[PDB]
Symmetry: C2
Subunit: 362 residues, 2 copies
């Protein structure tokens, strides 16, 4: 069967992992760890980058870094991963959900200010599908109300917004290194980006409980074995990105006649935003047309899957959070979004099979 | 070298297997296998692997629904994560002095610190040596307290037949390179012995339904699991070899211990260790630092252990020491950990002993 995703295989991961084993150091904060850190810092322009076991932990570290007390309201979309909210709820924060914009499925930068209260301190924007949000409106809103901006660029690796890299535009940035991402770091991984220099000294403390105790913290240490796996794929960062971009536009150029026919809808990439081709989604009227395609693709041995059940609709989202405004584009558009098979090791032969099955359905 | 990460020689073979499967993320193939291995071998109801023991400790505090104000009893002579994991839930830490023979929490000094706010007592198995669990379990049962086992060093070691980590409601394993089983450098394991705590355990490890409830990503990569699975395969071989090297230390350092010059580790009846470390107790902080500096001159790396948390600026802020600090501070400043690991050649072990006896 043709899966929806397969972990990035450069073919050099095995060689770099033997260097970590040969060095005799496999624990966190080792050699290849700091090398991946130096890589991300200079390439993206961030002041400091620390590697975590997961993007979830990075988000948890951020909520711990900004010193969140129970009662603090954090604004975020409900069309995101559960880790985005749970990381802040753990600190006692209440979540204020805001509807998304139907073109990019990102948080509407115009509806944010209405959700701001005296209890609000943090706003965490999610760069869905690698497509950056309107940062030149959000950062101004933060500046206007003295708020912190934590970027959830879990899918925004090798993505930029008007030049600047994602995870860099904001006080804190969070990268993901799961096997379902552009760079897998051995299956599990994450990265905390500390762009604000005034948050660095404490970030080092909470990274290793107390000054590597002085204060609370955790063990946000990713093994050096995983580091070597990541460093191997950062070496082919431009090769991986360009290949995924090639496979991405192949989907777009073949589904464009259907989009211009009004049958389906294609992803929108705003001016100034450069994606990384993390995923390719389409829109199918309702939830019955999407399922009809899902079952159709499954019959052709092709794996397709939707994305993100709205957090505000979940029973735990009704307890720790609240959807401000009108649920206009969040729930509806989520039930029609379908993700197509897209990964680095995807052969062009199989992609033609997927596309042929799509056009066959329509 | 004080410690070198355990190398069986078959780690590479099992990692290629994980890579060939096209799945390296958490809860993968080798993840289940490691969890199945630990459950049968030790007798645990449910074992879940974590990125670290610290994560497991935090997962434990989140599992028992620790609210701000709740008191947690533990020795101050423990790793920072043992206390830091509970403070994250807003708990207050109540430190209890140790017993000088095993450096474990004194089972007789615990009950004097129990209040109405006390909810969890977390014992720490030092050097793989078990705490007096029969007394501790009877304590908790009487005062309705949870027992979270911090067996970060007690893996493969037992207490009166029962493996450490399975004696109490929640246990915690560590898989660091400085431990007996490294799991690719980082790794941990939460042991859910209480069956009534199993259902909520799997939820908080994967946020919800596998949202539904608070939780985190306590998932460890299948790459590390593949590394760990190779280590658990040769569990007996590693254990016995480390136990062999441990006996060589005790046999040679016994005359000094009987002379009164130093003090060797004490192992209570019914307690079987796993030889995580061989500590000698000098006379003071000056005698220890003198040996450390002497061994360093002979290019031999020795090291002490963590400083009592109740003296640290965070411990006096987030916790309180109950009773008189009679042994914790003093014994900590005279304890010295000798070089000990699985790949320690017989040639280099004698060299250390030759340097030790030469100092005395």
């Amino acid at each position: 069967m043709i899966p929806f995703n397969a972990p990035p295989v450069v073919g050099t991961e095995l060689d770099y992992m033997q260097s970590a084993m040969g060095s005799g150091k496999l624990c966190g904060d080792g050699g290849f760890t700091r090398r991946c850190q130096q890589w991300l810092e200079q390439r993206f322009g961030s002041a400091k980058v620390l590697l975590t076991p997961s993007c979830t932990a990075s988000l948890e570290m951020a909520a711990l870094l900004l010193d969140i007390q129970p009662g603090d309201e954090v604004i975020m979309p409900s069309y995101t991963f559960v880790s985005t909210a749970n990381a802040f709820v753990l600190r006692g924060a209440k979540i204020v959900f805001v509807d998304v914009r139907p073109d990019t499925m990102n948080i509407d930068e115009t509806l944010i200010e209405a959700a701001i209260t005296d209890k609000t301190r943090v706003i965490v924007p999610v760069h869905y599908a690698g497509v950056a949000c309107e940062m030149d409106t959000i950062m101004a809103l933060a500046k206007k109300h003295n708020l912190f901006v934590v970027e959830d660029a879990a899918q925004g690796v090798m993505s930029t917004y008007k030049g600047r890299a994602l995870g860099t535009i904001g006080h804190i940035g969070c990268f993901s290194f799961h096997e379902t991402k552009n760079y897998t770091a051995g299956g599990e991984g994450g990265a905390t980006l500390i762009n604000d220099k005034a948050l660095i000294e404490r970030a080092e403390i909470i990274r290793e409980k107390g000054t590597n105790w002085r204060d609370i913290g955790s063990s946000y240490l990713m093994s050096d074995l995983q580091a070597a796996y990541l460093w191997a794929q950062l070496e082919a960062a431009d090769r991986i990105n360009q290949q995924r971009l090639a496979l991405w536009q192949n989907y777009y150029d073949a589904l464009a006649p259907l989009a211009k026919a009004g049958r389906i809808e294609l992803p929108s990439i705003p001016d100034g935003c450069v994606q990384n081709a993390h995923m390719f989604y389409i829109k199918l009227r309702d939830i019955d047309d999407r399922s009809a395609l899902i079952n159709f693709l499954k019959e052709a041995e092709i794996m397709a899957v939707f994305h993100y059940i709205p957090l505000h609709g979940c029973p735990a989202g009704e307890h720790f959070g609240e959807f401000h405004g009108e649920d206009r584009y969040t729930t509806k558009e989520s039930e029609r979004l379908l993700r197509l098979p897209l990964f680095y090791n995807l052969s062009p032969v199989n992609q033609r099979t997927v596309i042929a099955t799509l056009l066959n359905y329509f």
